[PDB]
């Protein structure tokens, strides 16, 4: 029984699988140096981290 | 020389000695020259509270001997 | 035999921690059965008097019960003093 | 139980903890042991419908031991009454 | 009361030292001094952004294993029971099952961190 | 006021609950649950259960540590909410504090109160047992019985923890 | 007498500050190697109470040990600004002192005193580890001369 | 008379901690073919005082992005809980005699972790966040093994009371029957106290300063003081556990001398170990505990449950 | 009843209302489940300790054991919800309206 | 619902044993041997009557036997007993194992004279 | 070594437990008199305090059964001073 509230409803996927999203699984960015014991003091190592 | 490290160790040792010595002496002083009573279990507390009443001065560590029987 | 002696040496070479772990856990399960002393453990636990021993009303027909703590009747801990 | 396999097989999976008058370690008794014994023995075997009426006396006592609600009303009334007299200078508690 | 006095004294002294530390020194506050540290260059993004956990599975397992120690801690008291046959069996049964779960998680690669 | 220690701790118990039930950032929600687990330890300890009180405090310290790590990974945002940052959070927080305050105020004033039900405000000491002189801890003997009387309990809990390990590995595998 | 008390209190705080100087773990080029040699066993700066610490929040001294480029200049200013006070700067070597042998370079800051205030200038290319140690001791004697509380008293 | 006793506990602890910093610097110095502090006072004896005064007249900083309340709370909690770990220690008499003194220490140690977690989080900085999450990982690594090791040892002691460990070891040190547990315990306390080769939450060469990178001046000192107070406390705990000292009730000071020497020597080994090894990678720390210590600790717990029963040597409950 | 019961039952009711009144973070609600156990643990412990019902002293321990199982299961699902959407918001879990 | 009967104060008046727990512990082993009869009679009455008010007379004989037992010690072994419980009183846990020598002096005295 | 010493510790524990059992009849006899006296004192001071109150009957049992019931802390230390109530209730739990 269609109504205004259910106008936007759509049938589910045939195999019950909804497409994976990409909501932003962004990495952490870190200035590793220059001022850093392990960066020899003049290395700005820009490093993308997951954990 | 390595023995120049000893003065710092000695000072650290004397500091770590004080808490153990202070607690022992304070317990003797506060308990009439004896070890502070240990009451881990209700029975030991019961005997303590009886000694507090039996003492006559409300002090569980003041103990009465045969001089208190008639 | 050759399958297991071969097997044990492999794990002894690669994972000695697990060989030690399984050997110790195996002993804990097995030795309590083969120990002559395991029976005393339970006798000592029963001989410990956590509760007052409430006396029985002597009805005249109780020879195995004692009248005084120092009578011969009743369990003795002589085995415990020796132990 | 819905399926009384315990009483069928003669096995005790959980009846040992159901009541407080059951056998306890080292024979340590619960505070309301006597009341629960008396209530349980009163109501044994006659069913709840009868027990609710016929064992009422034993259950209210057991309930009084458990929650002590009538004891606290008796003590609350006395403590309130005593202070109502303290201000009026009409009572001197003993040494 | 002894214990509460000891706890009150410990944290009071710690609070007093913080108060001295903040009110005794000469302060000189400006924007560049108090900016977040990241080796001399301005941070890229907020430090409140999600930080992936690669040991997430071990952390959940820690919960289940931490409750085991609560179940095993009473064992020194359980050894005083006369019914020593039952306790020893059940004591060993619990530990073996704890060992079995570790073996299962180990073999299934639950202890290895995700990539 | 020392005869009212258990009640004072129970007040803080509720304040902690209001702290995390208003649902700020889980970082602060975890803190409130730690405070509640601390005074809860003290409340149980004051009825003679030092082991039980210490255990629940220890167990919840481990649980909240894992929650913290999960929060930074899966329940964070740019501006985590303290209790004052959000009207809904603050409104829920204020409502709980006021409800608790009026319950405490009236039960103390009258030495009794009715908060839906009847509660006696004379202090918790009145209901305590008067005859303890055994040479052991009753809480310890009861807990120690898990391994002699509670065979069946040991089996079901032992099995459930093994299944828990198995199940969390099924759930979290893609 | 307030004069006597504040005089003594300056001695106390000055002695504490010069006796516990913690340089930032911060080095730029060649001259950082001689700084490493000053920490090494022969000179053992730590025996003076001079301890390297990486965090600017926990540092008292910035030793600018090497060439400061234009690309590195904002970063050096950032970590200097993030030092709590009191803070001191030691300029080490010709590059940091006034540009040195890259003075006329398009990418080099002609002296680190264009970016930060400098307390002590240590000459050399590089200064020997002992020359740097002399510079640190000269900074200690400068701190020993501070009259903060005497000046506060007479304000 | 109890408040005086409390002060005769806190004040020596802080002074012992301060001079532990000097001793560490000297011992590392000589193990590194140098001298360490020898100018500030004779033999560097005044170096700790200069550091303490210097730090408390240094400007403290509240980072612009930090959560102010937790930023201030965290260092207070660290030092407050560090001092609270000492109140049940029998030397030979405890300040507070506790039935479950062992459990009390497990609870307070677990609560002290949050001073790392909340200081690192409250800083609102990436190196502080990384350091804090290393504390989560490092706690997950060791606590389960650490409590089960205590349980194995207490199956010979018979109770969670710390003073009973003295009675248990009247004839012999517990290190003989339980040296396999003593090794795994000793390593656990290194990870418990965040000490090298497990100095990962601060992890200087990787995270600059880790969880306390944003702390300066007095607030920083509190974390330092707490960290070193736990070094001593956990080596005292180790001495009580495994190297029990005989107690003569009429001359308790003899106990405190021998007990102090053992705890000092254990504390020196922490410095000795720091001078000798590189650092674990924090995922390798987890696998050390969960794949080596835990399988063996579980096996030994079974063994120490069975052994008293099969040898008829169950300790008294009291 | 005693006045401690007033606060503990109040705590249980607070965490129940916190549970039923969701916001966004699924983690925030998982905390309210842990809180509800804590109140149940404390209230059960008080009743058992005060009545001196010795064998029941072990069931608060059992209570905690299954609280961890319940929490661990909740965290396992939160991980999987976060992987799918990148947050733990509960408003994302609305595919099954249709 | 019915008032609770209570004994009068004079009904409860007895000559109490005013010695400290260390004195009792020093004498406990001999005291159990010498006073087992009125003691066990009183214990049997308590576990049967389940009423402190129904055992007062049996309770008074426990005291009268205890006082007589302690008067015997004061007659013959007052000094050796004093060293013994004094040594017990020193210990925080009141341990027998710390006082075996003074226990022997006390034990050989009551054995020889009593 | 640990086996031999623990056995000795068990024998010592039994000797200490037996000493307690010897003294329990005396302690029990004393506990009964103290409880009954404290109740007697409370009853007498109830009489005056609740004298003119309308329908109050002094020392009324809240129980139908006439069986003896052990008093709870309120019934025994109902009117006494806090320091005595505090010692009786929390003294053991708070002792160190
Ligand atoms: C010993 C205690 C040590 C901690 C002391 C905290 C105060 C530290 C001084 C300080 O706050 O800095 C200046 C700070 C102002 O600095 P600001 O940067 O200008 O203001 C920033 C905002 O206030 C925002 O500042 P904020 O982000 O820090 O938010 C304040 C607060 C949020 O507080 C609130 O929103 C309302 C109060 C709720 C906290 C109360 C407990 C919450 C529930 C737990 C129940 C505990 C009951 C016990 O955050 C907390 O959650 C602190 C909880 C501390 C609990 C302590 C353990 C109990 O405070 C004042 O000077 C006033
Ligand atoms: C014993 C005492 C009982 C124990 C509890 C004592 C209190 C202690 C605290 C307990 C924890 C409370 C948890 C609060 C919570 O997390 O709720 C979050 C919940 C949603 O959080 P959110 O995701 O941030 O959404 C914020 C906006 O509401 C979302 O934006 P919006 O688009 O929805 O804004 C329009 C809003 C406008 O609402 C309306 O439609 C007006 C209707 C009013 C009709 C009159 O629509 C609604 O919210 C409708 C739902 C209203 C609730 C249903 C009322 C029927 O916030 C609320 O809905 C308001 C609750 C705040 C006051 C809490 C007071 C608790 C009292 C409960 C009853 C106790 C009976 C006993
Ligand atoms: C709080 C109590 C701490 C007081 C410690 C005072 C330090 C004593 C001291 O200054 O050391 C000798 C120092 C030694 O002098 P010095 O630091 O200039 O020595 C230089 C290094 N040598 C000697 C190797 C070349 O005396 C002083 O410097 C005078 C300062 C006195 C401090 C103010 C006291 C008030
Ligand atoms: C483990 C516990 C250790 C705790 C150690 C606690 C410290 C013990 C040593 C205390 C020594 C005395 C402290 C004085 C430090 C004052 C800080 C300071 O130098 O500020 C200078 C300031 C300088 O004041 P000023 O007004 O002349 O100049 C500052 C203003 N601007 C920035 C504009 C120039 O003086 C004071 O703040 C007052 C000094 C009063 C001394 C009290
Ligand atoms: C998130 C911010 C947190 C910041 C840190 C704040 C400080 C937290 C400190 C830890 C809080 C938990 C405290 C738990 C203490 C438990 C210690 C203990 O159990 O022993 C103390 C004693 C029981 O002694 P016991 O031997 O077990 O039995 C009595 C026999 N005589 O029992 C006692 O001495 C009575 C103590 C009653 C008071 C308890 C108050 C607890 C308050 C919690 C806060
Ligand atoms: C490869 C090295 C690795 C290093 C790891 C760190 C381990 C360091 C261990 C430090 C402790 C070693 C033991 C030090 C002995 C202290 C000697 C002493 O002061 O007291 C004498 C003591 C005997 O006395 P006592 O212990 O009381 O008798 C036992 C009965 N309980 O002792 C008798 O000799
Ligand atoms: C994943 C499932 C894992 C299930 C693993 C279960 C392992 C259980 C192995 C058996 C452990 C107990 O093993 C058993 O212990 C009891 C006492 O402890 C011993 O019992 C022995 O000593 C006791 C008292 O000390 C006596 O009452 C008894 O008559 C005597 O036989 C048994 O001789 C031994 O066989
Ligand atoms: C009852 C207490 C004592 C019982 C011990 C309980 C713990 C048992 C640990 C698990 C044993 C089997 O589970 C584990 O499976 C893996 C296979 O992926 C084995 O092998 C694997 O792991 C090891 C170590 O990570 C690697 O060196 C090896 O490359 C890999 O093949 C492990 O060596 C084995 O330990
Ligand atoms: S001053 Fe000389 S040694 Fe130092 S960095 Fe410049 S060129 Fe290199």
PDB file of N, CA and C in Angstrom, chain F residues 1-7 45-50 123-136, chain K residues 13 16-17 20 24 31 35 70-78 81-83 85-86 88-90 92-94:
ATOM      1  N   UNK F   1      28.453  11.685  60.747  1.00  0.00           N
ATOM      2  CA  UNK F   1      28.485  11.590  59.318  1.00  0.00           C
ATOM      3  C   UNK F   1      29.247  10.382  58.788  1.00  0.00           C
ATOM      4  N   UNK F   2      30.027   9.756  59.664  1.00  0.00           N
ATOM      5  CA  UNK F   2      30.791   8.584  59.264  1.00  0.00           C
ATOM      6  C   UNK F   2      29.911   7.347  59.317  1.00  0.00           C
ATOM      7  N   UNK F   3      28.867   7.396  60.143  1.00  0.00           N
ATOM      8  CA  UNK F   3      27.860   6.347  60.117  1.00  0.00           C
ATOM      9  C   UNK F   3      27.059   6.352  58.826  1.00  0.00           C
ATOM     10  N   UNK F   4      27.192   7.393  58.011  1.00  0.00           N
ATOM     11  CA  UNK F   4      26.512   7.490  56.729  1.00  0.00           C
ATOM     12  C   UNK F   4      27.478   7.322  55.559  1.00  0.00           C
ATOM     13  N   UNK F   5      28.575   6.591  55.766  1.00  0.00           N
ATOM     14  CA  UNK F   5      29.568   6.425  54.708  1.00  0.00           C
ATOM     15  C   UNK F   5      28.961   5.703  53.514  1.00  0.00           C
ATOM     16  N   UNK F   6      28.215   4.628  53.767  1.00  0.00           N
ATOM     17  CA  UNK F   6      27.681   3.837  52.666  1.00  0.00           C
ATOM     18  C   UNK F   6      26.689   4.662  51.861  1.00  0.00           C
ATOM     19  N   UNK F   7      25.901   5.500  52.532  1.00  0.00           N
ATOM     20  CA  UNK F   7      24.979   6.355  51.796  1.00  0.00           C
ATOM     21  C   UNK F   7      25.721   7.414  50.995  1.00  0.00           C
ATOM     22  N   UNK F  45      32.454  -3.296  49.822  1.00  0.00           N
ATOM     23  CA  UNK F  45      33.463  -3.567  50.835  1.00  0.00           C
ATOM     24  C   UNK F  45      32.955  -3.256  52.234  1.00  0.00           C
ATOM     25  N   UNK F  46      32.054  -2.289  52.362  1.00  0.00           N
ATOM     26  CA  UNK F  46      31.559  -1.884  53.667  1.00  0.00           C
ATOM     27  C   UNK F  46      30.494  -2.818  54.216  1.00  0.00           C
ATOM     28  N   UNK F  47      30.051  -3.800  53.439  1.00  0.00           N
ATOM     29  CA  UNK F  47      29.162  -4.841  53.927  1.00  0.00           C
ATOM     30  C   UNK F  47      29.891  -6.154  54.168  1.00  0.00           C
ATOM     31  N   UNK F  48      31.218  -6.149  54.127  1.00  0.00           N
ATOM     32  CA  UNK F  48      31.999  -7.326  54.431  1.00  0.00           C
ATOM     33  C   UNK F  48      32.490  -8.110  53.239  1.00  0.00           C
ATOM     34  N   UNK F  49      32.331  -7.590  52.026  1.00  0.00           N
ATOM     35  CA  UNK F  49      32.806  -8.277  50.847  1.00  0.00           C
ATOM     36  C   UNK F  49      33.967  -7.572  50.183  1.00  0.00           C
ATOM     37  N   UNK F  50      35.144  -7.636  50.804  1.00  0.00           N
ATOM     38  CA  UNK F  50      36.317  -6.991  50.228  1.00  0.00           C
ATOM     39  C   UNK F  50      36.709  -7.634  48.906  1.00  0.00           C
ATOM     40  N   UNK F 123      19.953   5.367  58.168  1.00  0.00           N
ATOM     41  CA  UNK F 123      21.313   4.905  58.006  1.00  0.00           C
ATOM     42  C   UNK F 123      21.357   3.407  57.798  1.00  0.00           C
ATOM     43  N   UNK F 124      22.367   2.959  57.064  1.00  0.00           N
ATOM     44  CA  UNK F 124      22.443   1.561  56.675  1.00  0.00           C
ATOM     45  C   UNK F 124      22.943   0.668  57.793  1.00  0.00           C
ATOM     46  N   UNK F 125      23.562   1.248  58.823  1.00  0.00           N
ATOM     47  CA  UNK F 125      24.144   0.442  59.888  1.00  0.00           C
ATOM     48  C   UNK F 125      23.087  -0.351  60.638  1.00  0.00           C
ATOM     49  N   UNK F 126      21.852   0.150  60.686  1.00  0.00           N
ATOM     50  CA  UNK F 126      20.847  -0.437  61.565  1.00  0.00           C
ATOM     51  C   UNK F 126      20.577  -1.892  61.215  1.00  0.00           C
ATOM     52  N   UNK F 127      20.745  -2.276  59.944  1.00  0.00           N
ATOM     53  CA  UNK F 127      20.391  -3.624  59.511  1.00  0.00           C
ATOM     54  C   UNK F 127      21.538  -4.614  59.644  1.00  0.00           C
ATOM     55  N   UNK F 128      22.668  -4.211  60.216  1.00  0.00           N
ATOM     56  CA  UNK F 128      23.839  -5.071  60.244  1.00  0.00           C
ATOM     57  C   UNK F 128      23.698  -6.160  61.299  1.00  0.00           C
ATOM     58  N   UNK F 129      24.377  -7.278  61.060  1.00  0.00           N
ATOM     59  CA  UNK F 129      24.403  -8.371  62.021  1.00  0.00           C
ATOM     60  C   UNK F 129      25.225  -7.981  63.243  1.00  0.00           C
ATOM     61  N   UNK F 130      24.817  -8.496  64.401  1.00  0.00           N
ATOM     62  CA  UNK F 130      25.422  -8.135  65.675  1.00  0.00           C
ATOM     63  C   UNK F 130      26.299  -9.230  66.263  1.00  0.00           C
ATOM     64  N   UNK F 131      26.412 -10.386  65.612  1.00  0.00           N
ATOM     65  CA  UNK F 131      27.092 -11.510  66.227  1.00  0.00           C
ATOM     66  C   UNK F 131      28.125 -12.188  65.354  1.00  0.00           C
ATOM     67  N   UNK F 132      29.244 -11.513  65.106  1.00  0.00           N
ATOM     68  CA  UNK F 132      30.323 -12.040  64.280  1.00  0.00           C
ATOM     69  C   UNK F 132      31.552 -12.289  65.142  1.00  0.00           C
ATOM     70  N   UNK F 133      31.947 -13.555  65.258  1.00  0.00           N
ATOM     71  CA  UNK F 133      33.188 -13.906  65.933  1.00  0.00           C
ATOM     72  C   UNK F 133      33.701 -15.254  65.444  1.00  0.00           C
ATOM     73  N   UNK F 134      33.501 -15.544  64.149  1.00  0.00           N
ATOM     74  CA  UNK F 134      34.135 -16.683  63.526  1.00  0.00           C
ATOM     75  C   UNK F 134      35.516 -16.338  63.013  1.00  0.00           C
ATOM     76  N   UNK F 135      36.363 -17.347  62.860  1.00  0.00           N
ATOM     77  CA  UNK F 135      37.761 -17.058  62.546  1.00  0.00           C
ATOM     78  C   UNK F 135      38.023 -17.283  61.059  1.00  0.00           C
ATOM     79  N   UNK F 136      37.158 -16.717  60.225  1.00  0.00           N
ATOM     80  CA  UNK F 136      37.277 -16.798  58.774  1.00  0.00           C
ATOM     81  C   UNK F 136      36.384 -15.727  58.166  1.00  0.00           C
TER      82      UNK F 136
ATOM     83  N   UNK K  13      48.356 -24.055  62.891  1.00  0.00           N
ATOM     84  CA  UNK K  13      47.026 -23.482  62.730  1.00  0.00           C
ATOM     85  C   UNK K  13      45.994 -24.257  63.533  1.00  0.00           C
ATOM     86  N   UNK K  16      46.234 -23.304  67.139  1.00  0.00           N
ATOM     87  CA  UNK K  16      45.617 -22.002  67.371  1.00  0.00           C
ATOM     88  C   UNK K  16      44.096 -22.101  67.319  1.00  0.00           C
ATOM     89  N   UNK K  17      43.558 -22.905  66.403  1.00  0.00           N
ATOM     90  CA  UNK K  17      42.111 -23.071  66.326  1.00  0.00           C
ATOM     91  C   UNK K  17      41.564 -23.736  67.579  1.00  0.00           C
ATOM     92  N   UNK K  20      41.088 -21.393  70.457  1.00  0.00           N
ATOM     93  CA  UNK K  20      39.844 -20.645  70.324  1.00  0.00           C
ATOM     94  C   UNK K  20      38.655 -21.469  70.796  1.00  0.00           C
ATOM     95  N   UNK K  24      35.719 -20.520  73.601  1.00  0.00           N
ATOM     96  CA  UNK K  24      34.434 -20.100  73.051  1.00  0.00           C
ATOM     97  C   UNK K  24      33.293 -20.203  74.054  1.00  0.00           C
ATOM     98  N   UNK K  31      28.872 -13.156  75.807  1.00  0.00           N
ATOM     99  CA  UNK K  31      28.116 -12.483  74.757  1.00  0.00           C
ATOM    100  C   UNK K  31      26.627 -12.490  75.067  1.00  0.00           C
ATOM    101  N   UNK K  35      24.437  -9.013  75.444  1.00  0.00           N
ATOM    102  CA  UNK K  35      23.301  -8.740  74.570  1.00  0.00           C
ATOM    103  C   UNK K  35      22.044  -8.516  75.390  1.00  0.00           C
ATOM    104  N   UNK K  70      17.819 -13.034  67.087  1.00  0.00           N
ATOM    105  CA  UNK K  70      19.016 -12.239  67.310  1.00  0.00           C
ATOM    106  C   UNK K  70      18.747 -10.786  66.923  1.00  0.00           C
ATOM    107  N   UNK K  71      19.077  -9.818  67.772  1.00  0.00           N
ATOM    108  CA  UNK K  71      18.844  -8.420  67.406  1.00  0.00           C
ATOM    109  C   UNK K  71      19.766  -7.968  66.289  1.00  0.00           C
ATOM    110  N   UNK K  72      19.293  -6.999  65.517  1.00  0.00           N
ATOM    111  CA  UNK K  72      20.135  -6.335  64.539  1.00  0.00           C
ATOM    112  C   UNK K  72      20.749  -5.080  65.159  1.00  0.00           C
ATOM    113  N   UNK K  73      21.698  -4.483  64.437  1.00  0.00           N
ATOM    114  CA  UNK K  73      22.517  -3.429  65.026  1.00  0.00           C
ATOM    115  C   UNK K  73      21.658  -2.298  65.575  1.00  0.00           C
ATOM    116  N   UNK K  74      20.595  -1.933  64.862  1.00  0.00           N
ATOM    117  CA  UNK K  74      19.716  -0.887  65.357  1.00  0.00           C
ATOM    118  C   UNK K  74      19.065  -1.250  66.678  1.00  0.00           C
ATOM    119  N   UNK K  75      18.554  -2.477  66.782  1.00  0.00           N
ATOM    120  CA  UNK K  75      17.846  -2.874  67.993  1.00  0.00           C
ATOM    121  C   UNK K  75      18.747  -2.844  69.212  1.00  0.00           C
ATOM    122  N   UNK K  76      20.041  -3.069  69.025  1.00  0.00           N
ATOM    123  CA  UNK K  76      20.969  -3.176  70.138  1.00  0.00           C
ATOM    124  C   UNK K  76      21.601  -1.831  70.476  1.00  0.00           C
ATOM    125  N   UNK K  77      22.178  -1.160  69.484  1.00  0.00           N
ATOM    126  CA  UNK K  77      22.768   0.165  69.655  1.00  0.00           C
ATOM    127  C   UNK K  77      21.822   1.255  69.182  1.00  0.00           C
ATOM    128  N   UNK K  78      20.531   1.125  69.488  1.00  0.00           N
ATOM    129  CA  UNK K  78      19.556   2.048  68.935  1.00  0.00           C
ATOM    130  C   UNK K  78      19.723   3.465  69.446  1.00  0.00           C
ATOM    131  N   UNK K  81      25.610   6.299  71.694  1.00  0.00           N
ATOM    132  CA  UNK K  81      26.351   7.341  71.007  1.00  0.00           C
ATOM    133  C   UNK K  81      26.965   6.818  69.714  1.00  0.00           C
ATOM    134  N   UNK K  82      27.227   7.748  68.796  1.00  0.00           N
ATOM    135  CA  UNK K  82      27.723   7.370  67.479  1.00  0.00           C
ATOM    136  C   UNK K  82      29.039   6.610  67.579  1.00  0.00           C
ATOM    137  N   UNK K  83      29.969   7.092  68.405  1.00  0.00           N
ATOM    138  CA  UNK K  83      31.282   6.461  68.439  1.00  0.00           C
ATOM    139  C   UNK K  83      31.169   4.991  68.824  1.00  0.00           C
ATOM    140  N   UNK K  85      28.341   3.180  68.265  1.00  0.00           N
ATOM    141  CA  UNK K  85      27.689   2.575  67.110  1.00  0.00           C
ATOM    142  C   UNK K  85      28.685   2.401  65.973  1.00  0.00           C
ATOM    143  N   UNK K  86      29.515   3.417  65.730  1.00  0.00           N
ATOM    144  CA  UNK K  86      30.475   3.340  64.636  1.00  0.00           C
ATOM    145  C   UNK K  86      31.473   2.217  64.866  1.00  0.00           C
ATOM    146  N   UNK K  88      30.966  -0.524  66.640  1.00  0.00           N
ATOM    147  CA  UNK K  88      30.299  -1.818  66.558  1.00  0.00           C
ATOM    148  C   UNK K  88      29.988  -2.207  65.121  1.00  0.00           C
ATOM    149  N   UNK K  89      29.695  -1.235  64.263  1.00  0.00           N
ATOM    150  CA  UNK K  89      29.276  -1.527  62.898  1.00  0.00           C
ATOM    151  C   UNK K  89      30.463  -1.665  61.952  1.00  0.00           C
ATOM    152  N   UNK K  90      31.317  -0.650  61.897  1.00  0.00           N
ATOM    153  CA  UNK K  90      32.383  -0.594  60.911  1.00  0.00           C
ATOM    154  C   UNK K  90      33.766  -0.764  61.512  1.00  0.00           C
ATOM    155  N   UNK K  92      35.466  -3.306  62.734  1.00  0.00           N
ATOM    156  CA  UNK K  92      36.234  -4.419  62.193  1.00  0.00           C
ATOM    157  C   UNK K  92      36.617  -4.176  60.741  1.00  0.00           C
ATOM    158  N   UNK K  93      35.662  -3.732  59.924  1.00  0.00           N
ATOM    159  CA  UNK K  93      35.945  -3.547  58.509  1.00  0.00           C
ATOM    160  C   UNK K  93      36.964  -2.440  58.307  1.00  0.00           C
ATOM    161  N   UNK K  94      36.954  -1.427  59.164  1.00  0.00           N
ATOM    162  CA  UNK K  94      37.851  -0.295  59.023  1.00  0.00           C
ATOM    163  C   UNK K  94      39.183  -0.485  59.730  1.00  0.00           C
TER     164      UNK K  94
END
